[PDB]
Structure formats: C-alpha cells, structure tokens
C-alpha cells in the first residue's frame, strides 16, 4: 500500500457569531473526511459512504456520547486558556491527533494543540512529555504530565489503536483510497512554460522542471495540488524562459510509482 494516515481535529470557539458552532470535530483518512460532529447537530455522522455502510448504529451512538463529553471538556479547557491569557473577545482552540502507516510498514503518531491557530502544546510519545510554547502552555504541561497514566494511554492509542482503526477504515474504503488514476499532463506557453496535470488520484504528485538535465528549484513556480470536485486533483508548475539563449526544458511528473517526462521541443 502507499502511505496512509488517519487524523481527527477538534475546533472550539469561545464567542462565536449567530449560527457558527461552538465545537466541531472531523476525522480524515488521507484527504477524505470520514466523520463529523458539531455542537449544533450533537450527532456523530459519516462523511464518506464507505463509513456509513461498514459501521453499525452502535458505533455512531457510542461516539456521539463521547463527543458530547469531549465537547464540554473542550469548552472548559478553552475557558481556562483564555482566562490565563487574559484575553477578551472570541478565540479558538484546536486539537489534532492521528497516525501514519508508511509504505515500508513503519508508523508515526502525533498529538498537538493550538490556540488562535498557533502551536500550543505538542506531545512527544517517545519521551512521554509535552512541549510548551509559552507559560500558559507551561502551566497545562505541568498538570498534564502529573497524570502519567494518561500520557501512557495516549502513547498506546497513537501507536496501537490509531493504526488498527486506520487499517480497518482503509479496507472499508479500499475502492476509493487504494485506487490509482494517472494524471493527464500537458505543456503550454503563457513568457513561461506551464506544465499542467489533471484527473489524477491520489493527490500526492511531484512535478518539476529540468533545464538541460539539471533541476532549477529556485527558478520554478510550484502550484498547489487542488481538488477538481470529482474525486481527482490537478496541479501545475511554471518556469521562466530565457529569451537570450535556447535551453532544453523538460517537465518531470512522478505519481504513484510512475515517472513521466515531457520534453519541450
């Protein structure tokens, strides 16, 4: 298999406007949303059809209850942070947890928190400790590290449970997650040469330009990998043409173990 990852985010807002939820939690497998929950629906719901078809109502009912408790804890945590920062107005609190199953079989695992969109606390599951970015985070670090059992529980969940969930979801959605749609790639002039690819899945792709056989990293403009809306992605890379001297320019595309070269005449 290619590399795959599972991750869950949480978002809390301390003073949201009229309709916006106080709390949102979404899970992903790779780039695909799989689960959602917020403080308005108060229900955990599938975001991918292959999650709905493979997890019985007992699953969604249980995690709905857990998420209602997690929602309340997030509110209490954010209130504490904003009190200790001495901040007025509306502020955000965020969490991300997850794991990666790499092609070679090795694994990674991660857990971190953010306040107002900036790193706040980052878990190290090897040293079993929390990295604090400031003294509000330092106070939380001390309280969390005093509960050593919870640190060990988080290490076990990242290393064993998360990976087991991921393999389970990967089999559920294997028709989506494990398929390959190779890119359609073309070159055009607009003076710079634009190498454009579209129609491809998975979104991971490497496009670069060579000049007479050498890569020119500082000279290349890399476009974002963007969704086209039909399950496939598109991307591009540009390079500026020398009007004083001819050169041998070629676009190089790497995708899912296949390399492609478009030499520009």
């Amino acid at each position, epitope marked *: 298999m290619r590399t795959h990852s599972l991750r869950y985010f949480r978002l809390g807002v301390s003073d949201p406007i009229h309709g916006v939820p106080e709390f949102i939690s979404v899970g992903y497998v790779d780039s695909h949303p799989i689960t959602t929950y917020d403080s308005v629906t108060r229900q955990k719901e599938p975001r991918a059809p292959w999650m709905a078809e493979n997890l019985a109502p007992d*699953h969604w009912e249980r*995690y709905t209850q857990l998420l*209602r408790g997690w929602q309340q*804890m997030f509110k209490v945590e954010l209130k504490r942070l904003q009190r200790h920062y001495n901040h007025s107005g509306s502020h955000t609190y965020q969490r991300m947890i997850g794991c990666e199953l790499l092609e070679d079989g090795s694994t990674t695992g991660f857990l971190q928190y953010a306040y107002d969109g900036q790193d706040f606390l980052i878990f190290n599951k090897d040293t079993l400790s929390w990295l604090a970015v400031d003294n509000v985070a330092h106070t939380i670090k001390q309280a969390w590290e005093a509960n050593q*059992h919870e640190l*060990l*529980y988080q290490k*076990n969940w990242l290393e064993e449970e998360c990976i*087991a969930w991921l393999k389970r979801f990967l089999e559920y959605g294997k028709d989506t997650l494990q398929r390959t749609e190779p890119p359609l790639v073309r070159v055009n002039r607009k003076t710079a040469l634009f190498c454009k690819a579209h129609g491809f899945y998975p979104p991971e792709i490497y496009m670069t330009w060579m000049k007479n056989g050498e890569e020119i990293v500082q000279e290349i403009d890399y476009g974002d990998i963007l969704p086209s809306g039909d399950g496939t992605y598109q991307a591009w890379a540009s390079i500026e043409l020398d009007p004083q001297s001819s050169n041998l320019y070629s676009c190089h595309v790497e995708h899912s173990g296949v390399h492609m070269v478009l030499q520009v005449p």
Partner: antibody
Amino acid sequence: QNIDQPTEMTATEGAIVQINCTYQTSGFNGLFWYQQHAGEAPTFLSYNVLDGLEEKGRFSSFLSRSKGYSYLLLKELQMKDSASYLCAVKDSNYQLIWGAGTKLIIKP
Amino acid sequence: NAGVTQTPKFQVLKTGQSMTLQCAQDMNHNSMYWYRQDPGMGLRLIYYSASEGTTDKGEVPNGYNVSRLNKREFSLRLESAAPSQTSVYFCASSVWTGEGSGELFFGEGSRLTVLE
C-alpha cells in the same frame, strides 16, 4: 469480548498471591484492577496500558498487551486483603468490560 | 467530600411497584453511571451519562430509566419492578469519559429484592 479471572483463590497470611486476568476485546485502551470488600463499594487499585510491571505499595500490577494478560500481585498478605478483586478493560469504543471478580480468601 | 452518595441502602419491592434510586456526587465529576452487580458475572452497565445534559443506554437498559437531573445527580428509575431486577445497584462517577486512564468512584450500593 470476554474477561476471565479465577472465581476464588486461597492463600496464607504473609505469603504472596498472583491474581490473573486474561481478556479478549475489540481494541484496548487500558486494564483496571479494583478491590471490593464484601458488602462495600469497589475502589480503584491500578491502571496498566503499556507493557510491564507497576508497583504501588504491597500491590503490583503487570500487563502484557500481546498476550492479553494481566496479573495483580499482592505481597505479604494480611487478613485485611480478604476481598474480591475485579479486573476491567476498556475496549476500542471506551466501553468498560468487567471480569466476574476473584474472591481472595486468606488463611490466618 | 462525601464522594458518591446513593440511597436507599436496602429496599423490598413487590412485583409491579415503582422505585427510584438516588445518586449524587460532590466531586465536580462530569460522567455518571448506574451498574448492577449479580453473582457469577461482572458489573453490567444499565445507563450512563457522559456529561451533563446527555444520557444513553448501557448494556442492560430494559426495565429502567434514568435522569441526569443536574451535574451532581443521576437518578435510576424502576417503573414496574420485576423479580429479575433483584440485584445490588451501584452508582459511579468519573471526572470525564472517553479518557482511557480515568478511574471510577463508586457509591455504597443499593440492595433491591423484588418479590411476587
């Protein structure tokens, strides 16, 4: 999903006893031991989630995730250790699954 | 600092009679639980309350109902008692739920005997 522990064990005062708990569960988020004196409430004894042995006074609790096995070790048994010992495991959905308990009888 | 306080300690009931068991905690816990303990088997969850304002069935909810009245109180209701509900009932609480290492704190237990 099953949690198994012996119904009853009998040991002599001053000796050592090892109470086994094996579990088969859908996922694993930790194993708990609780002490329950007859007619009283269970109270929390230990929590294990990584492999190895943790010590707390005369009691130690061991965990092997790969073997799906824990034991509660009581050293230097006293009469006040006569009680039931409950093991319990949190599964992948954070459901606590309780073993039926081991009644420990101590011979003075 | 009473911990978990449940009542009554003992109760005889006739089949068909209604009963409410009370439970309060003064530990500012968010999660509360109602278990029954019977010979030869582990504790079985009847109903639980992950947080104030939500409750849900456990493993053996039939014949029972609950009310998370506030953050402190979690009452258990036997609307029409049956002999099968002869048991010792335990209320418990934890700081949160969905947290692997947090332990349960138990009340003293309530012994119900339901008779024809």
